[PDB]
Design a protein around this ligand. Sequence first.
Ligand SMILES: N[C@H](C(=O)O)[C@H](O)COP(=O)(O)O
Ligand SMILES: [Zn+2]
Ligand SMILES: [Zn+2]
Lengths: 328, 328
Amino acid sequence: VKTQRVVITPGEPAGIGPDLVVQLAQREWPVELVVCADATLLTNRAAMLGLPLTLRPYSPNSPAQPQTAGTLTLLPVALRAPVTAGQLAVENGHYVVETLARACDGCLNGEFAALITGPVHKGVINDAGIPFTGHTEFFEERSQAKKVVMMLATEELRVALATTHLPLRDIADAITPALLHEVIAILHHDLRTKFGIAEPRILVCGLNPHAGEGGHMGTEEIDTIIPVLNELRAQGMKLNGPLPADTLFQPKYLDNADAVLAMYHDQGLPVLKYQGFGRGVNITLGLPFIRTSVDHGTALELAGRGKADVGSFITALNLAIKMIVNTQ
Amino acid sequence: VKTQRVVITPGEPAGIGPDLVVQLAQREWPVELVVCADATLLTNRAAMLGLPLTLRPYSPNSPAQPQTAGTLTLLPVALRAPVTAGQLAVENGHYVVETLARACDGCLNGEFAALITGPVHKGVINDAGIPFTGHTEFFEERSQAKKVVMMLATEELRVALATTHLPLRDIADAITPALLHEVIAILHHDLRTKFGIAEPRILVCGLNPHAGEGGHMGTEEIDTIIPVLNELRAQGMKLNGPLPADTLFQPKYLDNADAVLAMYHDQGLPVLKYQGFGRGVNITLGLPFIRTSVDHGTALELAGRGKADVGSFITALNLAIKMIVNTQ
Ligand SMILES: N[C@H](C(=O)O)[C@H](O)COP(=O)(O)O
Ligand SMILES: [Zn+2]
Ligand SMILES: [Zn+2]
């Protein structure tokens, strides 16, 4: 075997991302942590946190080495303008996107085994003149993936979303057999390839409350969800549902499920989030490479102040690492 | 101070209601338990269950006495036909309705401090030729309430819904400024008068994911929810602005709030039910009196078995009692 490299994008410079990566670095890792950011950004934020940091250069033509405590490997990307923790600078929006692109191309070219992302501020990137709606869409497009699936996990409890950031009013018409097929196909695929689960068991939420309670509250279950599920069950897929979302999240269901598929954003994320603020991991399924992420914002207000909380970033990294085994 | 009386309606005679009430009786209570039902029904179901039961008559002229274990106070209403657990008899629909009317009237008279309802089967009542649009609708209409708001609580969390059992595709257009003002006024009002919370703190969910994030994920927050909340805040009402549902359910928020207002069914109930479950109690806001209700159905398939589970009924009663204590 060979020591693996993972690429990490701290995210918004003025945000908590660099703070968190400097903190990640205070411990040992079984992989080489290739951080794609500006060297000075990290050096300065480290100082502000009274934390030690020595950076070694990313060297593609030398073997990778596990990351020792107090260090990080650096894939340099220059900042557009000077940084002040907590204050945004539109020009640095190009900087952020650049790190994302480079880290993404590194996973596509096989340079890196996984990609872990810090938080980014969508607003400032747009302000810079760059259409950006989030990492998920960014990688999906740059990776030219047919379709990606957003997942949230806290360990055994994993929730995927059939639809993501759509206005509530657009969800219903979005639930088509075509969409359910791709999403579930990907969910089933990745649970096997990336999560190492031979025969994955997926728990599916209905669209309406009470899963449509017959026909009194919506026809989507009887019209498209149920039919598709049985089309897939015949394909050998182990699927349970559709079930009511406020009943589905129980031991008699979860204990025998490897993942839950929610029809929409606020149907599945609240329970997961209430299951623990930190320790929550964002995962993108459907990409050619493993991509995990923190499950929180840039928290400009905390940047450089040292009240961090690297729990989510650390779990994100541990998961990506554990995931590398199943793919390599 | 003085011992209060609460009225309980076992509900559908053939369902588990009577079973649940006979078990409730096996323990002492700080209030007098007035059960509006047919004596024989209760006596018999007690036999079938191997549980002891002594019924004392409702004596409004006497001082209310806390209920002693193995006993119940009876407000007599006669069945129209013999009851066979697990079998619906249309004729008895008239019985169910009469108990509901009598209990309701008693709550408007001041005879009873609160109403705790057992499960009722709508179908059989309608099949009997009795117009009845639903359990809570009956009390809403008879008490002349203009609007009721459904809430689910567990001692550690209270969640009210702006909309209830509607198809998902109908929620967006239902969230109007009128509905919200009406829903929040009632929620603010009752948190004071029924829960005894002076200066109530309310958390409000946005309709869209990330609360519409600016307006990149929907406009309802900007066009309706935010304007409404602002007006109400102008009246001193403590309202924590529209927060993304997936971040709202967390200590920094919940620990600072008395109630959470969710926009739709699956946005609040899953968290509430994962945070407790059976501990869940349905409270009807908007009526002139306190009304709690079990969380299950008539479950005719369980009546007369012995595997009832008066748990939910107990948390329902316990909750109404507390509400009485904090409002006297
Ligand atoms: N709702 C997701 C979460 O809970 O983290 C978040 O929007 C994902 O954003 P990205 O596409 O930027 O990873
Ligand atoms: Zn999101
Ligand atoms: Zn419901």
